[PDB]
Amino acid sequence: SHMVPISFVFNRFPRMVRDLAKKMNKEVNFIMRGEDTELDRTFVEEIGEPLLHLLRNAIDHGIEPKEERIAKGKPPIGTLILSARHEGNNVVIEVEDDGRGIDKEKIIRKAIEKGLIDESKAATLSDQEILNFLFVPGFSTKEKVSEVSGRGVGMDVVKNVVESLNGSISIESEKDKGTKVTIRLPLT
Amino acid sequence: SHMVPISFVFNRFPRMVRDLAKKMNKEVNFIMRGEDTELDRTFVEEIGEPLLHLLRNAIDHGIEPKEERIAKGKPPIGTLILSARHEGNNVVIEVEDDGRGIDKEKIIRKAIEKGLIDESKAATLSDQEILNFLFVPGFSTKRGVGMDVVKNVVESLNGSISIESEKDKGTKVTIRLPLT
Ligand SMILES: Nc1ncnc2c1ncn2[C@@H]1O[C@H](COP(=O)(O)OP(=O)(O)NP(=O)(O)O)[C@@H](O)[C@H]1O
Ligand SMILES: Nc1ncnc2c1ncn2[C@@H]1O[C@H](COP(=O)(O)OP(=O)(O)O)[C@@H](O)[C@H]1O
Ligand SMILES: [Mg+2]
């Protein structure tokens, strides 16, 4: 229908990442790629808060303090990459950091706490099954709210919004390596 | 507390360079210097990707096919040099080729086409000013390209990168890494 460059969504992030990193005293080099990539104009408002949340998660939970990254033998400065591109009939948006990765042990503990799984079933969960708990509505306690809709935001809300746009989301994460979240939205 | 010879990352290039040259129909004499230069293990592990990008750039955009160098009145075989040395409290790595050199007019034309500068302004730019457009994200055409990825990885190591080039003489990319 009506395509516009994704820069309408991306433009405000450099400054927000700068301030967020400074507030949580993290050294972060923010990289944005493919701002010219176009998407439906009716996706602009809705995809913004969800993306901000993924960026916040990277800065807060992913990128470790300089001292910790040096101990791990990693580049002192963490890298946060926000990218967009066209891949077939879809707009692909990625948020990737080279931080400590999602604490899967913590996710399992939370899942058990929320009655989503029994402890006997947790030992054999695959990484994908574990990371997927993050998409269960109500999984995250929440606090950060969407300046657009007004609902608290967690990975569960991110997935819910992405599904509302008829798209999908996947997560990849390895301990001390980092986390990569990929969102695929339809072109039309 | 973990210095290690840069040879741990340099040793893998001779074969990469040869395969790239054959793939691109370029005849290149590859030279490596200061492979005994010690630097933080971390930098050694991370600098591989960037250096590969610079070496590939030299073999692709820089070194001209032997037939062209001959026609141009230059030594038939192209020369590509990868070196490391100490300069005060910094390790300096350089990738230099004696190719055609970065086309600065091409850069200027692109900047004008993208609306970054008008013609009058383009005429007053210094060479360094022109070359730095190569670092503007998105400036260059289609994992992340070459110069953008090189500068970002280098700066994540608290390093610095500069470019130098002369038409038909060649290009030299310099990377400065801190002492740990
Ligand atoms: N050694 C060189 N000699 C001549 N031109 C060069 C050299 N290195 C870089 N360039 C020029 O600088 C521009 C950009 O290099 P870079 O950012 O690595 O992009 P790329 O080579 O076009 N594409 P990609 O293959 O994605 O990295 C090139 O497109 C060339 O025009
Ligand atoms: N990029 C990331 N790096 C490391 N951990 C992450 C990342 N993104 C999310 N997480 C982890 O997943 C859990 C939940 O994320 P989410 O549902 O967005 O909740 P929250 O809003 O509480 O930050 C987080 O509490 C954190 O432990
Ligand atoms: Mg390149």
Answer yes or no: do B46 and A79 touch at CB < 8 A.
Answer: no
Radius of gyration for chain A, computed over Cα atoms and rounded to the nearest angstrom = 17
CA dist list (Å): A51 to A46, A73, A154, A158, A160: 9, 29, 11, 8, 13
Alpha-carbon span B97 to B81, nearest angstrom: 6
Experiment used for this model = X-ray
Alpha-carbon span B17 to B169, nearest angstrom: 20
B142 contacts B70 by C-beta, under 8 angstroms: no
Question: Which tokens belong to B110?
Answer: 């692109």
The residue with tokens 């944005």 is A32
- The boundaries of the domain holding residue B15 are 1-180
The residue with tokens 């002369």 is B166
DSSP-derived letter for residue A103 is -
Q: Which amino acid is at B36?
A: D
Length of chain B: 180
Quote the minimal CA–CA distance from A79 to chain B in Å: 7
Among B41, B137, B157, select the one facing A75 at the smallest CB separation. B157
Q: How would you classify the pairing of strands B28-33 and B3-5?
A: unpaired
Task: Tell me how crowded residue B115 is: count the other CB atoms within 10 A of its CB.
Answer: 7
The residue with tokens 């746009």 is A165
The H or E element spanning position B27 is none
B27 contacts B17 by C-beta, under 8 angstroms: no
- Non-local (6+) Cβ contacts of B46 within 8 A are A75, B153, B156, B157
Question: Which tokens belong to A66?
Answer: 């300089």
B119 contacts B112 by C-beta, under 8 angstroms: yes
**Sign of the Cα pseudo-torsion (A163, A165, A166, A171, in order):** negative
Answer yes or no: do A75 and B137 touch at CB < 8 A.
Answer: no
Q: What's the structural domain count of chain A?
A: 1
* CA B34–ligand 1 middle distance (angstroms): 25
Residue ranges in chain A assigned as alpha helix (H): 7-10, 13-23, 44-57, 66-71, 104-113, 119-122, 127-131, 155-164
CA dist list (Å): A91 to A37, A64, A94, A96: 8, 30, 10, 16
- Non-local (6+) Cβ contacts of B156 within 8 A are A29, A75, A76, A77, A78, A79, B46
DSSP-derived letter for residue A53 is H
CA dist list (Å): A117 to A83, A132, A173: 34, 12, 21
Task: Tell me how crowded residue B141 is: count the other CB atoms within 10 A of its CB.
Answer: 6
A109 contacts A123 by C-beta, under 8 angstroms: no
B128 touches chain A (CB under 8 A): no
Alpha carbon of residue B104 to chain centroid: 15
Alpha-carbon span A147 to A56, nearest angstrom: 14
Answer yes or no: do B155 and A77 touch at CB < 8 A.
Answer: yes
Question: Which tokens belong to B12?
Answer: 């893998």
DSSP-derived letter for residue B132 is G
Question: Which tokens belong to A122?
Answer: 């947790």
Question: Which tokens belong to A60?
Answer: 């807060």
Quote the minimal CA–CA distance from A75 to chain B in Å: 5
**Sign of the Cα pseudo-torsion (B85, B90, B91, B92, in order):** negative
**Chain A residues closer than 8 Å to B158 by CB:** 76-77
CATH number at residue A135: 3.30.565.10
- Non-local (6+) Cβ contacts of B7 within 8 A are B35, B36
The candidate with the shortest Cα–Cα distance to B50, out of B127, B151, B174, B124, is B151
